[PDB]
Amino acid sequence: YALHDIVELSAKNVACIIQAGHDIFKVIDETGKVSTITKGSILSKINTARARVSSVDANGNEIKIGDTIVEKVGSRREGQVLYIQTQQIFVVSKKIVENAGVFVVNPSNVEAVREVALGKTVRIRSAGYKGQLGIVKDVNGDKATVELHSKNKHITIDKHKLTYYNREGGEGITYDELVNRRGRVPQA
Amino acid sequence: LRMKHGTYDKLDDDGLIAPGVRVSGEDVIIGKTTPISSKRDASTPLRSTENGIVDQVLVTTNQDGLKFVKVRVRTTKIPQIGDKF
Amino acid sequence: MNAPDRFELFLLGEGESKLKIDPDTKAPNAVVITFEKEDHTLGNLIRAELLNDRKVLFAAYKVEHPFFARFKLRIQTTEGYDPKDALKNACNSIINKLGALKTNFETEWNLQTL
Amino acid sequence: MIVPVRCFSCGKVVGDKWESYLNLLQEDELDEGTALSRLGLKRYCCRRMILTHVDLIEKFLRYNP
Amino acid sequence: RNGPNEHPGAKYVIRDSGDRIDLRYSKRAGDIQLQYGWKVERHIMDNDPVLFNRQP
Amino acid sequence: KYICAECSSKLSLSRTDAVRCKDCGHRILLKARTKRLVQFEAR
Amino acid sequence: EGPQVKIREASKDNVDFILSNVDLAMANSLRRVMIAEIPTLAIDSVEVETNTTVLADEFIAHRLGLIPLQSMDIEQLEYSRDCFCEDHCDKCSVVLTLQAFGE
Ligand SMILES: [Zn+2]
Ligand SMILES: [Zn+2]
Numbered sequence A: 001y002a003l004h005d006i007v008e009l010s011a012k013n014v015a016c017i018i019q020a021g022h023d024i025f026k027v028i029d030e031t032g033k034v035s036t037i038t039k040g041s042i043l044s045k046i047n048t049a050r051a052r053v054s055s056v057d058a059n060g061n062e063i064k065i066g067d068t069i070v071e072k073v074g075s076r077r078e079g080q081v082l083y084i085q086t087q088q089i090f091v092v093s094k095k096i097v098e099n100a101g102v103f104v105v106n107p108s109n110v111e112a113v114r115e116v117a118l119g120k121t122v123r124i125r126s127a128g129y130k131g132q133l134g135i136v137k138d139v140n141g142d143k144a145t146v147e148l149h150s151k152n153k154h155i156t157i158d159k160h161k162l163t164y165y166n167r168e169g170g171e172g173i174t175y176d177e178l179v180n181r182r183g184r185v186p187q188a
Numbered sequence B: 001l002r003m004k005h006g007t008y009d010k011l012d013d014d015g016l017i018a019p020g021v022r023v024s025g026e027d028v029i030i031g032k033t034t035p036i037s038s039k040r041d042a043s044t045p046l047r048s049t050e051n052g053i054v055d056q057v058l059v060t061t062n063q064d065g066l067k068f069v070k071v072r073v074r075t076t077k078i079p080q081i082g083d084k085f
Numbered sequence C: 001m002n003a004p005d006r007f008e009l010f011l012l013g014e015g016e017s018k019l020k021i022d023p024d025t026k027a028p029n030a031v032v033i034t035f036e037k038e039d040h041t042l043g044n045l046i047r048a049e050l051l052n053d054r055k056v057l058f059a060a061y062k063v064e065h066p067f068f069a070r071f072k073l074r075i076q077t078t079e080g081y082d083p084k085d086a087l088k089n090a091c092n093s094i095i096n097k098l099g100a101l102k103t104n105f106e107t108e109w110n111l112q113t114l
Numbered sequence D: 001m002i003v004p005v006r007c008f009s010c011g012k013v014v015g016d017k018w019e020s021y022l023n024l025l026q027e028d029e030l031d032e033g034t035a036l037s038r039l040g041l042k043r044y045c046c047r048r049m050i051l052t053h054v055d056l057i058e059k060f061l062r063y064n065p
Numbered sequence E: 001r002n003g004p005n006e007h008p009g010a011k012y013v014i015r016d017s018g019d020r021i022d023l024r025y026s027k028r029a030g031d032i033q034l035q036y037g038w039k040v041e042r043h044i045m046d047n048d049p050v051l052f053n054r055q056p
Numbered sequence F: 001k002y003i004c005a006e007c008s009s010k011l012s013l014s015r016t017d018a019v020r021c022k023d024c025g026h027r028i029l030l031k032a033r034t035k036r037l038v039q040f041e042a043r
Numbered sequence G: 001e002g003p004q005v006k007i008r009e010a011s012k013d014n015v016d017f018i019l020s021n022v023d024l025a026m027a028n029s030l031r032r033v034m035i036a037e038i039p040t041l042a043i044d045s046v047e048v049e050t051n052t053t054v055l056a057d058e059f060i061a062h063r064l065g066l067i068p069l070q071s072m073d074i075e076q077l078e079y080s081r082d083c084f085c086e087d088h089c090d091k092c093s094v095v096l097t098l099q100a101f102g103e
């Protein structure tokens, strides 16, 4: 375990390390109390990057891990959020030396500073390349990138105006059955 | 554990794209996996700067009997401004 | 790999006007008309018709680049004569001449047995 | 492989007369220019399109596939 | 909003923290609100100086 | 799923099977074109 | 009166004539529209179901595209990009089938 690492002390206790030792670690808990524990007291390390935890600030703006926030009351400490607890947030600040710059604050007291089309043969309907077979590569949201079979170029076209066909021939279906009905190529 | 951007959907059950399949960018042409001791992908991605319709695929045995695959891809190139004559 | 859309040459793009008329400050009573998705075919004929009119003073067509199907026609007429009216008259004269030529060709073809 | 469908220069269709061209060269034993003129090729673009063509399609078909 | 696919657009957005977020891989590109001090990797536009050279 | 270079006869062999033609000793074992619909344009 | 046409000779697919009382620009524009702006019908899309000839699918498709097609009633036909159709409806396209094999 290294500095600033998140440690799951128990099923409901999460702490942040402020002084990473060999076998003895000083950790501040969600309640702000700083205590010294042993390596055995840590069940496992919580991965902040893989932790999909979000909270709501006073202004209502969503705050995620790593976002810079400033306390509305107190010393107005500014710092980056390392982890988000059910009722508390741990924030590390480079301007504070106390507790390695890590402090636990309430979220309300701070303010912030499955594609069906992909991988299926399609034909364009309303464009300059209508009626041309294409293979969907990726979708950027509201627009689908398709490579044309007869042309060595990739074109971005709205997916709603494309008709999808079966892997081998089959009938054409617009972008209304896959959204409603589960992704299933028609029968050839 | 080793997976590349190449789309493996074009690959069939045998692992080789049949003639008449559109391939572009890093799309995998030959699907090969080397067991590790469970296995790591060793596919042959298509040339990034070249693309076209796969023309032919053949499978044979090497001098030692190991499976060998050769895939020829054909593209139609039309004269452009930058072409040299 | 990035060749221009061939159909786009003669097809208007999304949110694109066929004609764009703007004033010209180089000379009084001078206008610039940008024709989109057009080639020398129409520009040269329109300019030639305009030059045949005594009232029209200056009429010049320019193609900025072969890549883009677009040209610009600068038209300057006498005081009190709107360039748009001159362009409309030239287009009407062109239509009349084309109709007369079509009628003459049809009559000649009908007259000839072959 | 096969005779071009249309002349590169003008676009006149020249693929119809390739078989007629070969027949005139062989059956009638006519010279190249006379046969081309009879086929109805005035502009030298089509003349060189037909004369310069090589029938590689037959050579490719010589193989079993 | 145009996105990397469209020429008058961008492909990466640099936040204040310095982390770079790609637009093509992110499906919520249109929901990203730019803030002062950030940097965006925009495609080179017209009247953009660039050094042209020949190897010799 | 496969054809012979010389015999040009279908084999439809499966995995963990010999790649040699059943009719002849040749083992080129070419593969037939994909059944997926293919479209081309004169442009 | 305007411009008049004097047809020196006519044929099935070749007509030589003379235009008089016409500007050079008008004649050039007429030639340009006649060579480029005349609508015509030609093979645009080629779908291959079973091809094993020595040639290539793109090659044969390009050859087919250049094949002339009757276009006397082209005006009646409408562009595919214009009419509201899914793909190559009978109202905007002509469908043909090519089948052959050796012996
Ligand atoms: Zn010719
Ligand atoms: Zn065999």
Ligand SMILES: [Zn+2]
Pocket (backbone or CB within 6 Å): G079, G080, G083, G084, G085, G086, G087, G088, G089, G090, G091, G092, G093
């Ligand atoms: Zn239609």
